[PDB]
Amino acid sequence: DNSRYTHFLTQHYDAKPQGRDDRYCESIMRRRGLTSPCKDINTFIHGNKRSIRAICENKNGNPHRENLRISKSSFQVTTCKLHGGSPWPPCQYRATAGFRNVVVACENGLPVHLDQSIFR
């Protein structure tokens, strides 16, 4: 089963972004189906897939808290953060580009969850 890894890539991987602004967040949150209801906070990781996969191996991760993993290398990221009063669309987002290691959960050497706590 890979359904949760492919879901992870849909929710948290964008390979080649140029501008990582408010409008990027608004756009990509819709492309990936995170707008009914408006998801409160969501972070996309950039670069290649293989660096992210490698977080599950010792090659690029240490264990972390309860059964999570934290990357050794830093990733370019963009956190899209819902604003306005409503959980229902139109969903508008404030973007925060960052550069940092990431925390994921792994299952079968594949990341299936991003811990969003580190990006609040």
Residue numbers in the entry: 2 to 121
Authors' text:
Angiogenin (ANG), a 14-kDa basic protein is an angiogenic ribonuclease and member of the bovine pancreatic ribonuclease (RNase A) family (also known as RNase 5). Like RNase A, ANG cleaves preferentially on the 3′ side of pyrimidines and follows a transphosphorylation/hydrolysis mechanism. In addition, the crystal structure of human ANG has revealed that it has an RNase A fold and the catalytic triad (residues H13, K40 and H114) is conserved. The enzymatic activity of ANG is several orders of magnitude lower than that of RNase A towards conventional RNase substrates, but essential for its angiogenic effect.
K54 does not participate or belong to any of the known catalytic sub-sites of ANG6. The variant K54R retains ~49% of enzyme activity. In this PD variant structure this residue is exposed on the surface of the molecule. Also, in the variant structure the Arg side chain makes a water mediated interaction with R51.
